[PDB]
Amino acid sequence: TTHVLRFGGIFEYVESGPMGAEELAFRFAVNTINRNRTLLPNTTLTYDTQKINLYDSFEASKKACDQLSLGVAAIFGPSHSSSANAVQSICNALGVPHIQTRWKHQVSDNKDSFYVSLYPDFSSLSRAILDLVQFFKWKTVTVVYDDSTGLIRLQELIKAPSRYNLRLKIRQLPADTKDAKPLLKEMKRGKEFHVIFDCSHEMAAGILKQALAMGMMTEYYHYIFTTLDLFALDVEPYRYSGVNMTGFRILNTENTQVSSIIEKWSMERLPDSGLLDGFMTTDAALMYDAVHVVSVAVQQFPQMTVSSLQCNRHKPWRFGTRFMSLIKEAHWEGLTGRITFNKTNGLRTDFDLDVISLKEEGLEKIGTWDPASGLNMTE
Amino acid sequence: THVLRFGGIFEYVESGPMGAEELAFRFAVNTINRNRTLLPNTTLTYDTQKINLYDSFEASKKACDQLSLGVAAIFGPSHSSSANAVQSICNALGVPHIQTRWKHQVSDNKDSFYVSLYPDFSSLSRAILDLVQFFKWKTVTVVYDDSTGLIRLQELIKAPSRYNLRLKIRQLPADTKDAKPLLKEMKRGKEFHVIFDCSHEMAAGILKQALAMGMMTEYYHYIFTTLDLFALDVEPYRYSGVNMTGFRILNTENTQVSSIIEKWSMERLQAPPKPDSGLLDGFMTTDAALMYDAVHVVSVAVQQFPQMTVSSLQCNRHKPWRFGTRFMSLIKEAHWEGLTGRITFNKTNGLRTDFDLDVISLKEEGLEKIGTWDPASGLNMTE
Ligand SMILES: *[C@@H]1O[C@H](CO)[C@@H](O)[C@H](O)[C@H]1NC(C)=O
Ligand SMILES: *[C@@H]1O[C@H](CO)[C@@H](O)[C@H](O)[C@H]1NC(C)=O
Ligand SMILES: *[C@@H]1O[C@H](CO)[C@@H](O)[C@H](O)[C@H]1NC(C)=O
Ligand SMILES: *[C@@H]1O[C@H](CO)[C@@H](O)[C@H](O)[C@H]1NC(C)=O
Ligand SMILES: *[C@@H]1O[C@H](CO)[C@@H](O)[C@H](O)[C@H]1NC(C)=O
Ligand SMILES: *[C@@H]1O[C@H](CO)[C@@H](O)[C@H](O)[C@H]1NC(C)=O
Numbered sequence A: 001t002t003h004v005l006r007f008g009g010i011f012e013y014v015e016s017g018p019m020g021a022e023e024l025a026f027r028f029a030v031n032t033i034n035r036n037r038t039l040l041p042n043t044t045l046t047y048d049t050q051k052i053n054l055y056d057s058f059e060a061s062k063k064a065c066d067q068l069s070l071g072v073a074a075i076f077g078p079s080h081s082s083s084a085n086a087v088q089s090i091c092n093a094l095g096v097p098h099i100q101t102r103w104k105h106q107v108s109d110n111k112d113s114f115y116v117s118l119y120p121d122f123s124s125l126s127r128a129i130l131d132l133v134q135f136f137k138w139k140t141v142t143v144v145y146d147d148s149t150g151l152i153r154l155q156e157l158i159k160a161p162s163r164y165n166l167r168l169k170i171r172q173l174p175a176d177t178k179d180a181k182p183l184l185k186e187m188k189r190g191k192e193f194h195v196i197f198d199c200s201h202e203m204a205a206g207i208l209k210q211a212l213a214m215g216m217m218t219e220y221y222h223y224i225f226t227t228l229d230l231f232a233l234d235v236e237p238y239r240y241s242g243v244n245m246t247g248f249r250i251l252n253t254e255n256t257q258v259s260s261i262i263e264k265w266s267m268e269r270l271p272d273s274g275l276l277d278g279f280m281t282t283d284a285a286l287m288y289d290a291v292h293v294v295s296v297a298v299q300q301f302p303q304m305t306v307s308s309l310q311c312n313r314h315k316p317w318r319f320g321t322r323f324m325s326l327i328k329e330a331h332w333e334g335l336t337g338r339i340t341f342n343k344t345n346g347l348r349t350d351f352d353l354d355v356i357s358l359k360e361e362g363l364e365k366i367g368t369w370d371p372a373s374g375l376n377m378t379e
Numbered sequence B: 001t002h003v004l005r006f007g008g009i010f011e012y013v014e015s016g017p018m019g020a021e022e023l024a025f026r027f028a029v030n031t032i033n034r035n036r037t038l039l040p041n042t043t044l045t046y047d048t049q050k051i052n053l054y055d056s057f058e059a060s061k062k063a064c065d066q067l068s069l070g071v072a073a074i075f076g077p078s079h080s081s082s083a084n085a086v087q088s089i090c091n092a093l094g095v096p097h098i099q100t101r102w103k104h105q106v107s108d109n110k111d112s113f114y115v116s117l118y119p120d121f122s123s124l125s126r127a128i129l130d131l132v133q134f135f136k137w138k139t140v141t142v143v144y145d146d147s148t149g150l151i152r153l154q155e156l157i158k159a160p161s162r163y164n165l166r167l168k169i170r171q172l173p174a175d176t177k178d179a180k181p182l183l184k185e186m187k188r189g190k191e192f193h194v195i196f197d198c199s200h201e202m203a204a205g206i207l208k209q210a211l212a213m214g215m216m217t218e219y220y221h222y223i224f225t226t227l228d229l230f231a232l233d234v235e236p237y238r239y240s241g242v243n244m245t246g247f248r249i250l251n252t253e254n255t256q257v258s259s260i261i262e263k264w265s266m267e268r269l270q271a272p273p274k275p276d277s278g279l280l281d282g283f284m285t286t287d288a289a290l291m292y293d294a295v296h297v298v299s300v301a302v303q304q305f306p307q308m309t310v311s312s313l314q315c316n317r318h319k320p321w322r323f324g325t326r327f328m329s330l331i332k333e334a335h336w337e338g339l340t341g342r343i344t345f346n347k348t349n350g351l352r353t354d355f356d357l358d359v360i361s362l363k364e365e366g367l368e369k370i371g372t373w374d375p376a377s378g379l380n381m382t383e
């Protein structure tokens, strides 16, 4: 009873240093499962990792074909959206499950059915952001987004001013944070004390610097962050100013089992950035959870074996339709909590969140949120 | 006598008439061949592949095939996610990719082998704005079709921080047939000034629900992002005295353009639009006049580069085309007077950020020109 089952992964290219955090979580999971007797006892997980420049969809395609030709049971495809788009179409045509860990816009007309996404969908996250804004009883707010795509992402937030009694201004960051000051100066001048920053944690770390410099880290302002990697941020410079800072957290650290696995990650890993060294970002804990979730579906389908499919020949995989289905019905308790997909969408629309805020002793849990029972504060 | 072949990827119609874009493509090619003054010694040929527009994989396989037959340009697909993939491929093999439909150009993306003939709404958003301020609106309601319209009209959505304006954002549901619950909220909220961001086909259908709801009156004013406003049947509404305003890129005012539009309404083999569609039969949409203009603009660059010839490139082998970098450049510097007016690309972006517009509004005697707009001198009304 020894069977070789191979996953493919397409990751970011760093010709200048260490492998990315996602590719590391991928390999770390595979190894952890192999060492685990209870999961895939008779089965042994192997893999093939290709590295590409993330916005060359053409390259992401050539490498997705190569892996379908070696034989792969799933492509844990790329992060960037336009490259994940192309690998999604390919995986569909050849009926190999595509596992996505990062959000991208699913065009409506698109009928691809061979995929799932582990990123918390903000059909839900937009509503969690909203539930939070109403709890603080804000009546004016200012949404500051990074790249145009954040409007599609937070569209349920942008529309609320027609239903509820709310008035928001929409501002954008410039390409480089190093002059987000002219903008911050307009918000200051306009007494925009309640703000929602829609950007990556790296951008958030850099914006809070400009904000401090501008005298906007005080008891007057309150900042809400869409980013789930709020704990990734160094908070020493601001916890005494008594700004308010709130965001969500998918990464279930409250559990000791998750904390210990996060520590083995800070291990076997490694300034003015504003980020904490040795921290597992959410994008990485999701990849680790995607390998585990797919594997839970593999343990239920021993009959299944890999197959060498070609992008020119057009012979859909034989166990494709059946595997992709086993996946969508999967249940797993990963680093990021309850995993369950939406049979309809393939998306993750139901999950649990910890709502975290900046007290004087650092970031702290002040409640929970799930789409069913909404916000649930502890006081 | 030299044979130069363009490739085109178009929408699949099993098995009715060929789409309007593919027809404008073939119509242009033929018109140029018959024209002595353009490509006199050169003869244009082509290969048209048909694909399902959201299978980017299929649009890829077919883009490779044409690069292998040998093509000087792929007038790639319309849908965005398929035009994305063909854009990357064209880039890797240095064959110009000609786009005629808007799509979001991700910022990090460095592909340089392409141009887009669709009027960019870094400019169109500003033209919509210039118009809103001329009417001196202080409240407006933007209704968009699919999420992507927010990225498109982002310069409009942000204006409430600069100017004195207050807009509500509403969305249409998948199917127009119940845009009534929404229209009923706008009515109840006295949202008399509205901007509809959707296709003309959706606009035709929404105006029906609006009439039914008693919102086609002298109280309402609707602005349309769509450039195909003249595509709409306007008989049912021109007497109600609603106000209806939008822009028009298609230079019909010119007789030469009108006659070519007439040869197009002719030779058209598509069943008239179903009654109850709300559209006029035999009408050249802007998406089609752009494709006709894209074949002509590229051809103006070909006439300047006789040395150039086609080459059979493979998607596995990786040997960029020999005249690629030089052709793609001749294109970006092109100037053409097409059906849609002044064509000129932005050397920086490859996009069409400078163009001319006719601003058109619904008078009682049908749709009418009431001014112009170009990014330089902004709005320019006649009164
Ligand atoms: C807001 O700021 C003050 C001072 O930092 C703090 O005491 C309060 O608890 C904060 N509010 C929340 C929701 O954390
Ligand atoms: C699946 O997706 C839709 C749209 O996002 C959502 O409304 C629906 O409730 C989801 N289904 C489940 C089972 O959660
Ligand atoms: C909400 O939170 C309270 C206290 O934190 C907890 O006791 C309760 O069970 C939660 N309710 C639900 C159903 O989420
Ligand atoms: C095409 O020839 C027509 C005459 O049919 C002429 O009017 C027009 O200028 C020509 N186009 C070009 C490129 O000169
Ligand atoms: C809007 O008002 C009436 C129709 O109700 C029309 O006569 C008038 O010309 C319109 N205004 C413009 C600028 O189109
Ligand atoms: C197009 O170039 C013009 C100047 O030639 C410039 O104003 C504009 O920024 C360019 N395109 C964009 C959208 O950046």
Ligand SMILES: *[C@@H]1O[C@H](CO)[C@@H](O)[C@H](O)[C@H]1NC(C)=O
Binding pocket: B377, B380, B381, B382
């Ligand atoms: C605006 O239009 C008028 C005619 O109505 C014309 O005389 C004038 O030149 C135009 N302005 C410019 C330069 O766009």
Ligand SMILES: *[C@H]1O[C@H](CO)[C@@H](O)[C@H](O)[C@H]1NC(C)=O
Binding pocket: A036, A037, A038, A039
């Ligand atoms: C293997 O992981 C640990 C032991 O290493 C065990 O607690 C866990 O349940 C196993 N994995 C599963 C859930 O099959």
Ligand SMILES: [Ca+2]
Binding pocket: A033, A034, A035, A036, A037, A039, A040, A041, A042, A043, A044, A045
């Ligand atoms: Ca194992």
Ligand SMILES: [Ca+2]
Binding pocket: B032, B033, B034, B035, B036, B038, B039, B040, B041, B042, B043
């Ligand atoms: Ca000719």
